[PDB]
Design a protein around this ligand. Sequence first.
Ligand SMILES: Nc1ncnc2c1ncn2[C@@H]1O[C@H](COP(=O)(O)OP(=O)(O)CP(=O)(O)O)[C@@H](O)[C@H]1O
Ligand SMILES: O=C1CN(/N=C/c2ncc(-c3ccc(Br)cc3)o2)C(=O)N1
Length: 205
Amino acid sequence: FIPCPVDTSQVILPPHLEKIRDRLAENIHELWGMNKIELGWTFGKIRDDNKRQHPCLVEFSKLPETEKNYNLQMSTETLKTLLALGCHIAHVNPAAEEDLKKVKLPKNYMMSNGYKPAPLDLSDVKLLPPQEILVDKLAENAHNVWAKDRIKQGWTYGIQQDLKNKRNPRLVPYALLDERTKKSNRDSLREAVRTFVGYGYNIEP
Ligand SMILES: Nc1ncnc2c1ncn2[C@@H]1O[C@H](COP(=O)(O)OP(=O)(O)CP(=O)(O)O)[C@@H](O)[C@H]1O
Ligand SMILES: O=C1CN(/N=C/c2ncc(-c3ccc(Br)cc3)o2)C(=O)N1
């Protein structure tokens, strides 16, 4: 398999966008954390799958650095992909970042070590058709960068998953992937673009 995403090599992130890059990394983690609780996952200091344990059930500020820093790199590369695709990222209203509310996660969405995700409540945020074809493209590219970075870490495909010999069945072309995983990814990058407009930024090629 040969994944190659958009080439962001020559793009430079502006320093004033390093904050929306971090806000985006927090929220996408909060969206990941919420759905993981819905899949029957709780907090724990050691990775026990049969016990529904995962250390990174804590808030974004408390993740280990080898895991936390990859999220901030994936956020940066998604921002650079927009600029590489010819989009200008501007700022529309700064008060939009203060007229931001978060979602009322029920009491069950409170974990053992006080971690309770609270993503931005962006259910009021509609997307134009051009923005739904861009989000669909963005989620496909996000798969290629994830696939190549694991291949560059030594990962190969396998019929079943192995967390030690680096094999994983999801390292396939985006058209080869199961539709359940595609949809999960397309939704996550949908909320990514929503976070930009939700924080008051504009995105037009
Ligand atoms: N699809 C995704 N979207 C956003 N963040 C993800 C992500 N997948 C993993 N992460 C990030 O990685 C951290 C969780 O560690 P990990 O990489 O092992 O995920 P995971 O255990 O769910 C993969 P698997 O589905 O195989 O179990 C979290 O902090 C999370 O933010
Ligand atoms: O097919 C797949 C694709 N994929 N995605 C890896 C995921 N890990 C971290 C992130 C991420 C995305 C956006 C932002 Br902003 C910040 C972090 O992407 C996976 O795990 N199997």
